[PDB]
Amino acid sequence: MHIERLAVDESVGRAMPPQRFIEALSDLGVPVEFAGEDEQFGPGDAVASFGHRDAFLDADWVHCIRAGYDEFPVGVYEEAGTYLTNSTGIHGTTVGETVAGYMLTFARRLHAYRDAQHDHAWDLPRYEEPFTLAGERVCVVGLGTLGRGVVDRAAALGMEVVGVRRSGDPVDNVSTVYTPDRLHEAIADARFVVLATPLTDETEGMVAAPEFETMREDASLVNVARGPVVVESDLVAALDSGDIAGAALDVFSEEPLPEDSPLWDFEDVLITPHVSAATSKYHEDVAALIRENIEKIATGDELTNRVV
Amino acid sequence: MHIERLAVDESVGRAMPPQRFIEALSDLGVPVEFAGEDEQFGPGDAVASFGHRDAFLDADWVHCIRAGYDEFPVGVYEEAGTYLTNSTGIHGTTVGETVAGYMLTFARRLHAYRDAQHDHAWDLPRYEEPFTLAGERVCVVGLGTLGRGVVDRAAALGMEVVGVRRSGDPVDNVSTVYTPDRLHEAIADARFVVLATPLTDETEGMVAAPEFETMREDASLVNVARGPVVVESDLVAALDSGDIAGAALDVFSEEPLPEDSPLWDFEDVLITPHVSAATSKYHEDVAALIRENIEKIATGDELTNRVV
Ligand SMILES: NC(=O)C1=CN([C@@H]2O[C@H](COP(=O)(O)OP(=O)(O)OC[C@H]3O[C@@H](n4cnc5c(N)ncnc54)[C@H](OP(=O)(O)O)[C@@H]3O)[C@@H](O)[C@H]2O)C=CC1
Ligand SMILES: NC(=O)C1=CN([C@@H]2O[C@H](COP(=O)(O)OP(=O)(O)OC[C@H]3O[C@@H](n4cnc5c(N)ncnc54)[C@H](OP(=O)(O)O)[C@@H]3O)[C@@H](O)[C@H]2O)C=CC1
Ligand SMILES: CCCC[C@@H](O)C(=O)O
Ligand SMILES: [Mg+2]
Ligand SMILES: [Mg+2]
Ligand SMILES: [Mg+2]
Ligand SMILES: [Mg+2]
Ligand SMILES: [Mg+2]
Ligand SMILES: [Mg+2]
Ligand SMILES: [Mg+2]
């Protein structure tokens, strides 16, 4: 690989202003150019993009500007001989902070107060409603960049932390790590269950009616992974039946979440519009990954975040 | 002083169910009795109360179940020989968590999402709006139990932390401690300014138009102290003018906050109903101070949290 050009697909617009991103890449040593839906690639092309296009298969290298690459046909890239990288490793602080925010919102009742603020109502909680995260248990399912960002902040707040990962191996600040076949043991005693796994064959529909049964009735689910990791209809049923207490949800089976979803109306559900990782500096964070991999290519070393 | 009785004033019901507090004081070595608003007191009586009654001055000891004793006439107690203690030392975790919650709410825009949830609207923030607390500066004004509860959590979240206290003496996790005569220096570069001082002759009206001028236009004020530490009309004016960005307010010059107050309507104000220290274990927290002081009276040692 000898890269002569970085093309920036217009789909990066879904996550950030393209112009800001192009300006963040200006002294790379190769030209950085905007590319639209209908363009052609070839030897020496690198491409930064949000979604997949078949035209990218003519390029040497595609960088997906998301951590999740579940919408990329990974097998076709391998067969085409086209390198594919992702943006894992940059979302730990933003997502960890958002999730700390969700848990504190539930513990301190901030969402109920915000509801009351609209009515100008000085509504006091029941004595038993407010609690402290200190001493409460969180189970973090997926212990990568997102999961660890959550873990570190939960641990800092004095929470008891357990979690689940594919390898079952120790993780700093996690008292007990479980393999995925022991999910029900992991979630059983947790006040919060946080989902931070990629969407894969194995994780799709992982959290469904049996898991909501196992969960504490006073527990909340947090999904910052992908919508289809949860069976959304089972989630609705569990919330209506009281199998769990509530949820903070950033990702959904259909996005935007349809207006007629029952999820919008549960008091103890927080809906956020796939923004748990949002940051005014996203363009710089992704640009740094692109720069790193340019140097890797130039010096003939293995790419950071290589999917295939 | 030899205590023969602990009277539990009915005003404790403003903070916790009195039956829960009475039962948590069962092993004091003296009887614990409820006291209505028309109750007589004499030698041997200790009282546990939320607010002041002149009737208390015939008792030997009043324990205020709040940290703030500004509604108690301290000069009137000293002259009368009646001991006064407060409940400072028990609100660090509850207030610390709530303030962390407020700051994360603003950084991650959760309040705006909650507003959109009511309308079933999938409304992304503007790109420049979401940020991370990590790397941002907070000034904590008041470095006692509440202030340290805030500091420790802000520091753990990766914030730069400075603060203000009377003595100027070092405090763990505060990088620069200022005395109150350098308030403007302390607050000028802060993204968040947090108030955690008592209401005193010195602190009343501390934060007014000139301080809102000094503060960053992108900064937010957090008030978990007492309403009159801030000049409320100057706050409204500052929020209208954009001298600051917003505020999280748990305390007000008049509580409950009047429906007609303009503070309810600012998008970037969070109103909470004097609940930043709310917890379902408050009865246990308050009882343990009372137990402590009972033992110190027996051994004839100096009381904890003695006011006069
Ligand atoms: N809401 C949002 O805006 C965002 C969502 N995401 C989503 O989060 C996902 C995770 O991203 P990131 O943390 O960067 O990814 P990482 O690759 O850093 O980590 C993935 C983690 O998931 C674990 N894992 C894999 N399969 C399973 C399983 N079956 N059960 C439990 N754990 C499993 C891995 O285990 P091991 O450690 O053993 O390998 C690893 O700990 C992305 O794929 C994306 O879908 C990402 C960014 C933002
Ligand atoms: N919203 C709520 O529900 C609650 C509100 N509060 C309020 O918080 C107040 C503080 O409580 P707590 O932290 O327990 O009290 P503490 O006595 O532990 O701490 C008070 C702090 O205020 C500092 N201070 C005093 N005067 C000034 C000033 N002029 N400028 C800067 N700092 C000053 C003191 O400085 P130094 O240490 O140097 O003397 C001390 O560090 C209470 O009096 C009460 O009004 C308390 C509990 C709950
Ligand atoms: C969109 C950029 C991050 C958000 C999510 O898409 C991801 O997988 O990273
Ligand atoms: Mg309710
Ligand atoms: Mg259940
Ligand atoms: Mg707006
Ligand atoms: Mg930051
Ligand atoms: Mg003054
Ligand atoms: Mg002044
Ligand atoms: Mg209104």
Side-chain angles (χ1 to χ4, degrees), chain A residues 135-212:
Chain A
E136 296 282 334
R137 179 169 280 185
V138 57
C139 178
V140 183
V141 179
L143 292 168
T145 297
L146 272 64
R148 293 161 188 255
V150 175
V151 162
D152 290 344
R153 290 163 183 78
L157 289 162
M159 301 188 80
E160 281 173 21
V161 183
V162 301
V164 185
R165 72 191 288 210
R166 192 199 281 96
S167 66
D169 293 328
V171 176
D172 188 65
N173 292 321
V174 179
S175 293
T176 305
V177 177
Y178 295 91
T179 46
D181 54 316
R182 303 172 71 198
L183 178 66
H184 287 252
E185 283 180 72
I187 68 183
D189 301 314
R191 189 72 176 258
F192 297 97
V193 175
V194 178
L195 312 182
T197 57
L199 182 55
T200 68
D201 63 349
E202 282 276 0
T203 67
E204 186 172 358
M206 181 202 308
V207 178
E211 290 72 35
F212 300 127

Coordinates of all heavy atoms in Angstrom, one line a residue, chain A residues 135-212:
Chain A
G135 N -22.1 2.1 46.7 CA -22.6 0.8 47.2 C -23.5 0.0 46.4 O -23.9 -1.1 46.7
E136 N -24.0 0.6 45.3 CA -24.9 -0.2 44.3 C -24.1 -0.9 43.3 O -23.0 -0.6 43.0 CB -25.9 0.8 43.6 CG -26.8 1.5 44.6 CD -28.0 0.6 45.1 OE1 -28.4 -0.3 44.4 OE2 -28.5 0.9 46.2
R137 N -24.7 -2.0 42.8 CA -24.0 -2.9 41.9 C -24.4 -2.6 40.4 O -25.6 -2.5 40.1 CB -24.3 -4.3 42.2 CG -23.7 -5.3 41.3 CD -23.7 -6.8 41.8 NE -22.7 -7.0 42.8 CZ -22.4 -8.1 43.4 NH1 -23.1 -9.2 43.1 NH2 -21.4 -8.2 44.3
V138 N -23.4 -2.5 39.5 CA -23.6 -2.4 38.1 C -22.9 -3.6 37.4 O -21.8 -4.0 37.9 CB -23.1 -1.1 37.5 CG1 -21.6 -0.8 37.9 CG2 -23.3 -1.0 36.0
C139 N -23.6 -4.2 36.4 CA -23.0 -5.2 35.6 C -22.8 -4.6 34.2 O -23.8 -4.2 33.6 CB -24.0 -6.4 35.5 SG -23.4 -7.7 34.4
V140 N -21.6 -4.6 33.7 CA -21.3 -4.0 32.4 C -21.0 -5.2 31.4 O -20.1 -5.9 31.6 CB -20.1 -3.0 32.5 CG1 -19.9 -2.4 31.1 CG2 -20.4 -1.9 33.5
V141 N -21.9 -5.3 30.4 CA -21.9 -6.4 29.5 C -21.1 -5.9 28.2 O -21.7 -5.0 27.5 CB -23.3 -6.9 29.1 CG1 -23.3 -8.0 28.1 CG2 -24.0 -7.3 30.4
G142 N -19.9 -6.4 28.0 CA -19.0 -5.8 27.1 C -18.0 -4.9 27.8 O -18.4 -3.8 28.3
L143 N -16.7 -5.2 27.7 CA -15.7 -4.6 28.5 C -14.5 -4.1 27.6 O -13.4 -4.3 27.9 CB -15.2 -5.5 29.6 CG -16.3 -5.8 30.7 CD1 -15.9 -6.9 31.7 CD2 -16.7 -4.5 31.5
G144 N -14.9 -3.4 26.6 CA -13.9 -2.8 25.6 C -13.8 -1.3 25.9 O -13.9 -0.9 27.1
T145 N -13.6 -0.5 24.9 CA -13.5 0.9 25.1 C -14.8 1.5 25.8 O -14.6 2.3 26.7 CB -13.2 1.6 23.7 OG1 -12.0 1.1 23.2 CG2 -13.1 3.1 23.9
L146 N -16.0 1.2 25.3 CA -17.2 1.7 26.0 C -17.3 1.1 27.4 O -17.5 1.9 28.3 CB -18.4 1.4 25.2 CG -18.8 2.4 24.1 CD1 -17.8 2.6 23.0 CD2 -20.2 2.1 23.5
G147 N -17.3 -0.2 27.5 CA -17.5 -0.9 28.8 C -16.5 -0.4 29.8 O -16.9 -0.1 31.0
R148 N -15.2 -0.3 29.5 CA -14.3 0.2 30.5 C -14.5 1.7 30.8 O -14.2 2.1 31.9 CB -12.8 0.0 29.9 CG -12.4 -1.5 29.9 CD -11.2 -1.7 28.9 NE -11.0 -3.1 28.7 CZ -10.0 -3.8 29.2 NH1 -9.1 -3.3 30.2 NH2 -9.8 -5.1 28.9
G149 N -14.9 2.5 29.9 CA -15.2 3.9 30.2 C -16.3 4.0 31.2 O -16.3 4.9 32.1
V150 N -17.3 3.1 31.1 CA -18.4 3.0 32.1 C -17.9 2.5 33.4 O -18.1 3.1 34.4 CB -19.5 2.1 31.5 CG1 -20.6 1.9 32.6 CG2 -20.2 2.7 30.3
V151 N -17.1 1.4 33.4 CA -16.5 0.8 34.6 C -15.7 1.8 35.4 O -15.9 1.9 36.6 CB -15.6 -0.4 34.2 CG1 -14.7 -0.8 35.3 CG2 -16.5 -1.6 33.7
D152 N -14.8 2.5 34.7 CA -13.9 3.4 35.5 C -14.7 4.5 36.2 O -14.3 4.8 37.4 CB -12.9 4.0 34.6 CG -11.9 2.9 34.0 OD1 -11.8 1.9 34.6 OD2 -11.2 3.2 33.0
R153 N -15.7 5.0 35.6 CA -16.6 6.0 36.2 C -17.5 5.5 37.3 O -17.7 6.1 38.3 CB -17.3 6.8 35.2 CG -16.3 7.7 34.4 CD -16.8 8.2 33.1 NE -15.7 9.0 32.5 CZ -14.6 8.4 31.9 NH1 -14.6 7.1 31.6 NH2 -13.7 9.2 31.5
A154 N -18.0 4.3 37.1 CA -18.8 3.6 38.2 C -18.0 3.3 39.4 O -18.4 3.6 40.5 CB -19.4 2.3 37.6
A155 N -16.8 2.8 39.2 CA -15.8 2.5 40.2 C -15.4 3.7 41.0 O -15.4 3.8 42.3 CB -14.6 1.8 39.7
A156 N -15.2 4.8 40.3 CA -14.9 6.1 40.9 C -16.0 6.6 41.8 O -15.8 7.3 42.8 CB -14.5 7.1 39.8
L157 N -17.3 6.4 41.4 CA -18.5 6.7 42.2 C -18.8 5.8 43.3 O -19.7 6.0 44.0 CB -19.7 6.9 41.2 CG -19.7 8.1 40.3 CD1 -20.6 8.0 39.2 CD2 -19.9 9.4 41.1
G158 N -18.0 4.7 43.5 CA -18.1 3.8 44.6 C -19.0 2.7 44.4 O -19.4 2.0 45.4
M159 N -19.3 2.4 43.1 CA -20.2 1.3 42.8 C -19.4 0.0 42.9 O -18.2 0.0 42.8 CB -20.8 1.4 41.4 CG -21.6 2.7 41.2 SD -22.6 2.8 39.7 CE -24.0 1.8 40.1
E160 N -20.2 -1.1 43.1 CA -19.7 -2.5 43.0 C -19.8 -2.8 41.5 O -20.9 -2.7 41.0 CB -20.5 -3.5 43.7 CG -20.3 -3.7 45.2 CD -21.3 -4.6 45.8 OE1 -21.9 -5.4 45.1 OE2 -21.5 -4.5 47.1
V161 N -18.7 -3.2 40.9 CA -18.7 -3.5 39.4 C -18.4 -4.9 39.1 O -17.4 -5.5 39.6 CB -17.7 -2.5 38.7 CG1 -17.8 -2.7 37.2 CG2 -17.9 -1.1 39.1
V162 N -19.3 -5.5 38.3 CA -19.0 -6.8 37.7 C -19.3 -6.7 36.2 O -19.8 -5.7 35.8 CB -19.9 -8.0 38.3 CG1 -19.6 -8.1 39.8 CG2 -21.4 -7.7 38.1
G163 N -18.9 -7.7 35.4 CA -19.2 -7.6 34.0 C -19.0 -8.8 33.2 O -18.6 -9.9 33.8
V164 N -19.2 -8.7 31.9 CA -19.2 -9.9 31.0 C -18.4 -9.5 29.8 O -18.4 -8.4 29.3 CB -20.6 -10.2 30.6 CG1 -20.6 -11.5 29.7 CG2 -21.6 -10.4 31.8
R165 N -17.5 -10.4 29.3 CA -16.8 -10.2 28.1 C -16.5 -11.6 27.4 O -16.6 -12.6 28.1 CB -15.5 -9.4 28.4 CG -14.4 -10.2 29.1 CD -13.2 -9.4 29.6 NE -12.4 -9.0 28.4 CZ -11.1 -8.7 28.5 NH1 -10.4 -8.8 29.6 NH2 -10.5 -8.4 27.4
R166 N -16.2 -11.5 26.2 CA -16.1 -12.8 25.4 C -15.0 -13.7 25.9 O -15.1 -14.9 26.0 CB -15.7 -12.5 23.9 CG -15.9 -13.7 22.9 CD -15.1 -13.6 21.6 NE -15.8 -12.7 20.6 CZ -15.6 -11.4 20.4 NH1 -14.7 -10.7 21.1 NH2 -16.4 -10.8 19.4
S167 N -13.9 -13.0 26.3 CA -12.7 -13.7 26.8 C -12.8 -14.2 28.3 O -12.0 -15.0 28.7 CB -11.5 -12.9 26.6 OG -11.5 -11.7 27.4
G168 N -13.7 -13.6 29.1 CA -13.8 -13.9 30.5 C -12.6 -13.5 31.4 O -12.6 -13.8 32.6
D169 N -11.7 -12.7 30.8 CA -10.4 -12.4 31.5 C -10.6 -11.1 32.3 O -11.4 -10.3 32.1 CB -9.3 -12.3 30.5 CG -8.9 -13.6 29.8 OD1 -9.1 -14.7 30.4 OD2 -8.5 -13.6 28.6
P170 N -9.7 -11.0 33.4 CA -9.8 -9.8 34.2 C -9.7 -8.5 33.5 O -9.0 -8.3 32.5 CB -8.6 -10.0 35.2 CG -8.4 -11.5 35.3 CD -8.7 -11.9 33.9
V171 N -10.4 -7.5 34.2 CA -10.4 -6.1 33.7 C -10.3 -5.2 34.9 O -10.9 -5.4 36.0 CB -11.7 -5.8 32.9 CG1 -11.8 -4.3 32.5 CG2 -11.8 -6.7 31.6
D172 N -9.4 -4.2 34.8 CA -9.2 -3.3 36.0 C -10.5 -2.6 36.4 O -11.3 -2.3 35.5 CB -8.2 -2.2 35.6 CG -7.8 -1.4 36.8 OD1 -7.2 -1.9 37.7 OD2 -8.2 -0.2 36.9
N173 N -10.7 -2.5 37.7 CA -11.9 -2.0 38.3 C -13.2 -2.9 38.2 O -14.2 -2.5 38.7 CB -12.2 -0.5 37.8 CG -11.2 0.5 38.3 OD1 -10.8 0.4 39.4 ND2 -10.9 1.5 37.5
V174 N -13.0 -4.1 37.7 CA -14.2 -5.0 37.6 C -13.9 -6.1 38.6 O -12.9 -6.8 38.5 CB -14.4 -5.6 36.2 CG1 -15.6 -6.5 36.2 CG2 -14.6 -4.5 35.2
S175 N -14.7 -6.3 39.6 CA -14.4 -7.3 40.7 C -14.5 -8.7 40.2 O -13.6 -9.5 40.5 CB -15.5 -7.1 41.8 OG -15.3 -5.9 42.4
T176 N -15.5 -9.0 39.4 CA -15.8 -10.3 38.8 C -16.1 -10.2 37.4 O -17.1 -9.5 37.1 CB -16.9 -11.0 39.6 OG1 -16.6 -11.0 41.0 CG2 -17.1 -12.4 39.1
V177 N -15.4 -10.9 36.5 CA -15.7 -10.9 35.1 C -16.2 -12.3 34.7 O -15.7 -13.3 35.2 CB -14.4 -10.6 34.2 CG1 -14.7 -10.8 32.7 CG2 -13.9 -9.2 34.5
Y178 N -17.3 -12.4 34.0 CA -17.9 -13.6 33.5 C -17.8 -13.7 32.0 O -17.7 -12.7 31.2 CB -19.4 -13.5 33.9 CG -19.8 -13.5 35.4 CD1 -19.9 -12.3 36.1 CD2 -20.0 -14.7 36.1 CE1 -20.2 -12.3 37.4 CE2 -20.3 -14.6 37.4 CZ -20.4 -13.4 38.1 OH -20.7 -13.4 39.4
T179 N -17.8 -15.0 31.5 CA -18.0 -15.2 30.1 C -19.5 -15.1 29.7 O -20.3 -15.1 30.6 CB -17.4 -16.6 29.7 OG1 -17.9 -17.6 30.6 CG2 -15.9 -16.6 29.7
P180 N -19.8 -15.0 28.4 CA -21.2 -14.7 28.0 C -22.2 -15.8 28.3 O -23.4 -15.5 28.5 CB -21.0 -14.5 26.5 CG -19.6 -14.2 26.2 CD -18.8 -14.9 27.3
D181 N -21.7 -17.0 28.5 CA -22.6 -18.1 28.9 C -23.0 -18.0 30.4 O -23.9 -18.8 30.8 CB -21.9 -19.5 28.6 CG -20.5 -19.6 29.2 OD1 -19.7 -18.7 29.1 OD2 -20.2 -20.7 29.8
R182 N -22.4 -17.1 31.2 CA -22.8 -16.9 32.5 C -23.5 -15.5 32.7 O -23.4 -14.9 33.8 CB -21.6 -17.1 33.4 CG -21.0 -18.4 33.3 CD -19.7 -18.5 34.1 NE -19.9 -18.5 35.5 CZ -19.0 -18.2 36.4 NH1 -17.7 -17.9 36.1 NH2 -19.4 -18.2 37.7
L183 N -24.1 -15.0 31.6 CA -24.9 -13.7 31.7 C -25.9 -13.6 32.8 O -26.0 -12.6 33.5 CB -25.5 -13.4 30.3 CG -26.4 -12.2 30.2 CD1 -25.5 -10.9 30.3 CD2 -27.1 -12.2 28.9
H184 N -26.6 -14.7 33.1 CA -27.7 -14.6 34.1 C -27.1 -14.5 35.5 O -27.7 -13.7 36.3 CB -28.7 -15.8 33.9 CG -29.6 -15.6 32.7 ND1 -30.9 -15.3 32.8 CD2 -29.3 -15.6 31.4 CE1 -31.4 -15.1 31.6 NE2 -30.5 -15.3 30.7
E185 N -26.0 -15.1 35.8 CA -25.3 -15.0 37.0 C -24.8 -13.5 37.2 O -24.8 -13.0 38.3 CB -24.1 -15.9 37.1 CG -24.3 -17.3 37.4 CD -23.0 -18.1 37.4 OE1 -22.2 -17.9 38.4 OE2 -22.7 -18.8 36.5
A186 N -24.3 -13.0 36.1 CA -23.7 -11.6 36.1 C -24.8 -10.5 36.4 O -24.5 -9.6 37.1 CB -23.0 -11.3 34.8
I187 N -26.0 -10.6 35.8 CA -26.9 -9.6 35.9 C -27.9 -9.7 37.0 O -28.6 -8.8 37.4 CB -27.8 -9.5 34.6 CG1 -28.7 -10.7 34.4 CG2 -26.9 -9.3 33.4 CD1 -29.5 -10.6 33.1
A188 N -28.0 -10.9 37.6 CA -29.0 -11.2 38.6 C -29.1 -10.2 39.8 O -30.2 -9.9 40.2 CB -28.8 -12.6 39.2
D189 N -28.0 -9.8 40.3 CA -27.9 -8.9 41.5 C -27.6 -7.5 41.3 O -27.3 -6.7 42.2 CB -26.9 -9.6 42.5 CG -27.3 -11.0 42.8 OD1 -28.5 -11.2 43.1 OD2 -26.4 -11.9 42.8
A190 N -27.7 -7.0 40.0 CA -27.3 -5.7 39.6 C -28.4 -4.7 39.6 O -29.6 -5.0 39.2 CB -26.6 -5.8 38.3
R191 N -28.2 -3.5 40.2 CA -29.1 -2.4 40.1 C -29.1 -1.8 38.7 O -30.2 -1.3 38.3 CB -28.7 -1.3 41.1 CG -29.8 -0.2 41.2 CD -31.0 -0.7 42.0 NE -32.1 0.3 42.2 CZ -32.3 0.9 43.4 NH1 -31.5 0.8 44.5 NH2 -33.4 1.7 43.5
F192 N -28.0 -1.9 38.0 CA -27.9 -1.4 36.6 C -27.2 -2.5 35.8 O -26.2 -3.0 36.2 CB -27.1 -0.1 36.5 CG -27.8 1.1 37.2 CD1 -27.4 1.4 38.5 CD2 -28.8 1.8 36.6 CE1 -28.0 2.5 39.1 CE2 -29.5 2.9 37.2 CZ -29.1 3.2 38.5
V193 N -27.8 -2.7 34.6 CA -27.1 -3.6 33.6 C -26.9 -2.8 32.3 O -27.8 -2.2 31.7 CB -28.0 -4.9 33.2 CG1 -27.4 -5.7 32.1 CG2 -28.3 -5.7 34.5
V194 N -25.6 -2.6 32.0 CA -25.2 -1.8 30.9 C -24.7 -2.6 29.7 O -23.8 -3.5 29.9 CB -24.1 -0.8 31.3 CG1 -23.6 0.1 30.1 CG2 -24.5 0.1 32.5
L195 N -25.2 -2.4 28.5 CA -24.9 -3.1 27.3 C -23.9 -2.3 26.5 O -24.3 -1.1 26.1 CB -26.1 -3.4 26.5 CG -27.3 -4.1 27.2 CD1 -28.4 -4.4 26.3 CD2 -26.8 -5.3 28.0
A196 N -22.8 -2.9 26.2 CA -21.7 -2.2 25.5 C -20.9 -3.2 24.6 O -19.7 -3.1 24.4 CB -20.8 -1.5 26.5
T197 N -21.7 -4.1 23.9 CA -21.1 -5.1 23.0 C -21.4 -4.7 21.6 O -22.3 -4.0 21.3 CB -21.8 -6.5 23.2 OG1 -23.2 -6.3 22.9 CG2 -21.6 -7.0 24.6
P198 N -20.5 -5.1 20.7 CA -20.9 -5.0 19.3 C -22.1 -5.9 19.0 O -22.4 -6.8 19.8 CB -19.7 -5.6 18.5 CG -18.8 -6.1 19.5 CD -19.3 -6.0 20.9
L199 N -22.7 -5.6 17.9 CA -23.8 -6.4 17.3 C -23.2 -7.5 16.4 O -22.6 -7.1 15.4 CB -24.8 -5.5 16.5 CG -26.0 -6.3 15.9 CD1 -26.8 -7.0 16.9 CD2 -26.8 -5.3 15.2
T200 N -23.3 -8.7 16.8 CA -22.8 -9.9 16.2 C -23.9 -10.9 16.1 O -24.9 -10.8 16.8 CB -21.5 -10.4 16.9 OG1 -21.9 -11.0 18.2 CG2 -20.5 -9.4 17.2
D201 N -23.6 -12.0 15.4 CA -24.4 -13.2 15.4 C -24.7 -13.7 16.9 O -25.9 -14.0 17.1 CB -23.8 -14.3 14.5 CG -22.3 -14.8 15.0 OD1 -21.7 -14.2 15.9 OD2 -21.8 -15.8 14.5
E202 N -23.7 -13.6 17.8 CA -23.9 -14.1 19.1 C -24.6 -13.1 20.0 O -25.4 -13.5 20.9 CB -22.5 -14.4 19.8 CG -21.9 -15.7 19.3 CD -22.3 -17.0 20.1 OE1 -23.2 -16.9 21.0 OE2 -21.9 -18.1 19.8
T203 N -24.4 -11.8 19.8 CA -25.1 -10.8 20.7 C -26.5 -10.4 20.2 O -27.2 -9.8 21.1 CB -24.3 -9.5 20.8 OG1 -24.2 -8.8 19.6 CG2 -22.9 -9.8 21.4
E204 N -26.9 -10.7 19.0 CA -28.2 -10.2 18.6 C -29.3 -10.9 19.4 O -29.3 -12.1 19.6 CB -28.4 -10.5 17.1 CG -29.7 -10.0 16.5 CD -29.9 -10.1 15.0 OE1 -28.9 -10.6 14.3 OE2 -30.9 -9.8 14.5
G205 N -30.2 -10.1 20.0 CA -31.2 -10.6 20.8 C -30.8 -11.2 22.1 O -31.6 -12.0 22.7
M206 N -29.6 -10.9 22.6 CA -29.1 -11.4 23.9 C -29.9 -11.1 25.1 O -30.0 -11.9 26.0 CB -27.7 -10.7 24.1 CG -27.0 -11.1 25.4 SD -25.8 -9.8 25.9 CE -24.9 -9.8 24.4
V207 N -30.6 -9.9 25.1 CA -31.3 -9.4 26.2 C -32.8 -9.4 25.8 O -33.2 -8.6 25.0 CB -30.8 -8.1 26.7 CG1 -31.6 -7.6 27.9 CG2 -29.3 -8.2 27.2
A208 N -33.5 -10.4 26.4 CA -34.9 -10.6 26.0 C -35.7 -11.0 27.3 O -35.2 -10.8 28.4 CB -35.0 -11.7 24.9
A209 N -36.9 -11.5 27.1 CA -37.7 -11.8 28.3 C -37.1 -12.6 29.4 O -37.3 -12.3 30.6 CB -39.1 -12.4 27.8
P210 N -36.3 -13.7 29.1 CA -35.7 -14.4 30.2 C -34.7 -13.6 31.0 O -34.6 -13.8 32.2 CB -35.0 -15.5 29.5 CG -35.7 -15.8 28.2 CD -36.1 -14.4 27.8
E211 N -34.0 -12.7 30.4 CA -33.0 -11.8 31.1 C -33.8 -10.8 31.9 O -33.3 -10.5 33.0 CB -32.1 -11.2 30.1 CG -31.1 -12.2 29.4 CD -31.7 -13.1 28.4 OE1 -32.7 -12.7 27.6 OE2 -31.2 -14.2 28.3
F212 N -34.9 -10.2 31.4 CA -35.7 -9.3 32.2 C -36.3 -10.0 33.4 O -36.4 -9.3 34.5 CB -36.7 -8.6 31.3 CG -36.1 -7.8 30.2 CD1 -36.6 -7.9 28.9 CD2 -35.1 -6.8 30.4 CE1 -36.0 -7.2 27.9 CE2 -34.6 -6.1 29.4 CZ -35.0 -6.3 28.1

